[model samples]
Target chain A: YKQEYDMAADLVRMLRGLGVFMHAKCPRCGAEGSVSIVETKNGYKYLVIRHPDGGTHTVPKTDISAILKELCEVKKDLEYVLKRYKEYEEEGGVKFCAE
Target chain B: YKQEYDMAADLVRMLRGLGVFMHAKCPRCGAEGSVSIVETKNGYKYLVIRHPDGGTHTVPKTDISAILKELCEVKKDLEYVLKRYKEYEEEGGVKFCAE
Candidate 1:
């Protein structure tokens, strides 16, 4: 039974083993934080960024969904893993730490 | 010595325990994946987003940095925990799984 928890924990461990976070340089200001997504009142979307100190910028033409596809993938995978574990636990499985 | 690894692993475990991904619905489409950050051609930055099916949205005035401040905090904490474990290993600490 403990081994079951071990395996579940290992799965999560494996998940984290793969790096998270995008490595692209900030599209603007050449800084790491320069690039980010934004939305409008009329239901339009674009990329908006500015330097750390001053100045604002916008990328109204860019497709933000395409840029953040990977982020979605990360969340999807995380939810999948968590759901699997939750299913296992419903049958009386203890988590690695909980055991 | 083994406890050191256990402690470090526990720290990471604790980190994951707090949850990762943001829960805000997409700002543009009101979907889960609508909000994200983006960069510019020159050196400016902003937030961009869109609906899953179609259409683009932009929040030209929104400060993405503020929206994702918690994300940065998560990464910073993760790195801090990883670095701490690495230091322990350099001085001869075996991780929970390794041991």
Candidate 2:
């Protein structure tokens, strides 16, 4: 568990260094939006999330461990989705129209 | 253009091999759902999409090049999101609650 956590931390670090952000489907509200990170006045870190309603607010920084866990979760989710896509294609999965 | 297309194809192949799937927020209906790839009875490839209304559909396979473009777009988007996430954390971006 510790090793995994460390790996995730490193991955997160690498991602930030690249300044990339990906949009994710909100499992809660079923909306398309992205999460933003920000800092509070107390010099503490927090997440500035764009709500489904087009409002952005900060989710108080409560748990580092949990945040780390979520990072790993998203990372794994990406891996799973990519794999499924490939299988769908190779085994005769449909090609979609962009327009 | 051809090089990028080839790269996207290779990346798609890699993702399929790993059985990975990452969920993205649909810019269309703003739904938190996943797309599945399938084949039609005519031996043609297509995508089996689970609509926001809980309906599953098979989008007829039309253009291969367009599919390749979408694949690359998603790949680049992932890279961007990861980078942004990392930056948010390092710059004192808020940590969010899982619950």
Candidate 3:
């Protein structure tokens, strides 16, 4: 378990100083729209997220950079996927693995 | 541009007795969340969607089965992507296409 919220924390602080809402995925866990703000009397205290790999991360939630960063990461992934997709699209779609 | 509604027409008709709402992508045009119901004095009458490929499809909207079918198609594509992703996950990652 990694108990750090570096990107997400900064994201939150900057948002208040700047604004946003999200159900964004966790970069650490690859959980789409999983991480959420865990609040208390202090209000919007920390972030809590789960991993598909049986792990977790609890970082202090301060503000909104993480969402954009996460989105960028996903965009990056899709960019790669798009290239491969076009390749296969030309080569006649995905290959099949016979079992 | 094929002047036909086929799947979407039945989808809308089947739903008049059932129920649904969607920002669903179009299979014909491959536009994500683009198709929407267009209304006239006749009511929710037709489907209008743009293609990323410079085309269009406007089908009469009678009901709601199209969403599920479209979801199935995307799920099918992702299924193929998942296999390749796992293969690359094992073999490092995507290959660089140096330009």
Candidate 4:
């Protein structure tokens, strides 16, 4: 029995909602693709990248969670930086700056 | 003729330097792997994920450049926010604020 829950596919869809795209490159012809999930023989599922050069590259899944985690690091940093901006935008900082 | 230049491998290695990990999952056995690149028969290069459960899954490469591009977008946003922070950190806004 094949488990229909493809974690990579789910991650790709999630990332796409955030404006992320998964690329696939053919190891043979160097063809690049926007990527599609398809099942091959032996019930093996992979990503098919359709290149403009009439070439398709099949690729494996990626750990997008790792990347998303790092992006959260950026989010944390952004908040830290934004706080400084927010404090200054209060416009009463001068009395506080010198005081 | 086989091209030794694996774009996915290069992208994965590049991303690893920046703290990224690409995970591979098995479509058949539902096993997950940390992933390695190996050339199979027919000069097909794929990712081999060695699971702790003695189950190995061969996966295709991933398009990491797309993710990197999106990360750059965050960089751009960070700078835009930083500029606001910089403007406030100057601490000369009081004369400018009420003036």
Candidate 5:
């Protein structure tokens, strides 16, 4: 399903409606980053961008429900990833699932 | 195209936004009828009826733009058809283009 930016946009809206805003910079490398939603032919989609690090990832929409279900798990994982970059400056430390 | 009723509803909204409200009973048969809009995969669509006479018709959305362009002409045609419907009590005087 070819989705559009609105998929990402509406996903953010839905997440916001669910009262969860977990956006921040990459703590691992001290790099600024953010997520943006985009519309598509089938639906909306989201992408994560690491500003100075030049890293990109497409987070699948289907996986969002499970991820968001346990906010603490997501926060812990993000914190761990960022910590790795700060201590080791390693690439591929952040594992993204695009299922 | 397998259209839905929203076509008819939005057609009315556009016409109303353009300040054209031509809803009334059949002057010929004195039958009351109304229009309604519905949603579909393709888009929205509408349907009209003659309440007492039990007659129905689907006004094509494509024709709506041209018909709405000439407000007076559309109004006049409705009046004429309803009037004939009273004097002649005949159906099928109201013509609609699907294209």
Candidate 6:
């Protein structure tokens, strides 16, 4: 149980790191919208949310970044998160495993 | 506590009995899309996915499923909830102990 807990913690750390770099984009009109980062025990989960005004949304992970090199705005946010996390780890400020 | 266990078991059975049969199709071109059914304890969740295009998406779970049912229309819906679980047979299935 202890080991499993530790693994989960580590995974969370990784997810937090990855999340910083990932983002979602509108598959449609290419409009960037509100995005949120969600981390689950399974892995880094992403979503594309709506605002009810006919406005589009983008999230951290999606197929848009795969075929095309663009991610609305949410994608950019994730990338920023990822970049900062890398910087954090390189500075030796982050722990890889839970104690 | 015993009753709770029984209820959970009953819910699982109900989920299994309620065969999900929704078919998936792309919101963009109305071409049938591939989808899967997933059950979780936190209530039903939906998704809007994009194929490797500039190709658009409209998950029955995502947005678009409502635009025109033909235009940018897409919609996904489901139902399932778990409460105090009850169902098992440890001694016959999974035995719990208070002693």
User: Pick by DockQ: which candidate is best?
Assistant: 2
lDDT of 5 by residue, A1-99 (tens): 123223334434443332334353433434445444444677635544335456744555343332232233323433442343233213332111111
Off by over 4 Å in 5: A1-21, A24-33, A40-43, A47-52, A65-99, B1-99
Q: List the residue pairs that clash in candidate 4.
A: A23-B63, A59-B60, A60-B60, A60-B61
Compute the lDDT for candidate 5. Answer: 0.36
Per-model TM values vs. the true structure: 0.29, 0.34, 0.24, 0.24, 0.19, 0.19
Candidate 5 per-residue lDDT over residues B1-99, each given as its tens digit? 123223234434444432333343433334455433334577535434335455644445443332223333433433442343233212322111111
lDDT of 3 at A7: 34
DockQ for every model, please: 0.02, 0.08, 0.03, 0.02, 0.01, 0.01
- Model 1 reaches what TM-score against the true structure? 0.29
In the range A1-99, model 2's lDDT, one tens digit per residue, is 333333334544444443434344443444555544554588534444466678665433332344454565666656555564455445544342243
Could you tell me which 10 consecutive residues in candidate 2 chain B have the lowest summed lDDT?
B1-10
Give a tens-digit lDDT track for model 4, residues B1-99: 011124333333333333334454454446655544566588755545567766676543342222223334433444553454344325422111121
Worst 10 residues of 4 chain B by lDDT: B90-99
Candidate 3's TM-score reads 0.24
CA shift of B57, model 5, Å: 65
Docking level of model 3: incorrect
**In candidate 5, residue B52 scores what lDDT?**
43
Please give, as one word, the docking class of candidate 5.
Answer: incorrect
Residue A13, candidate 5: how far off, in angstroms?
4.9
Ranking of predictions according to DockQ: 2, 3, 1, 4, 6, 5
Q: How many backbone clashes does candidate 6 have?
A: 39
Candidate 1 positional error at B20, Å: 11
Name the lDDT value of residue A29 in candidate 4: 50
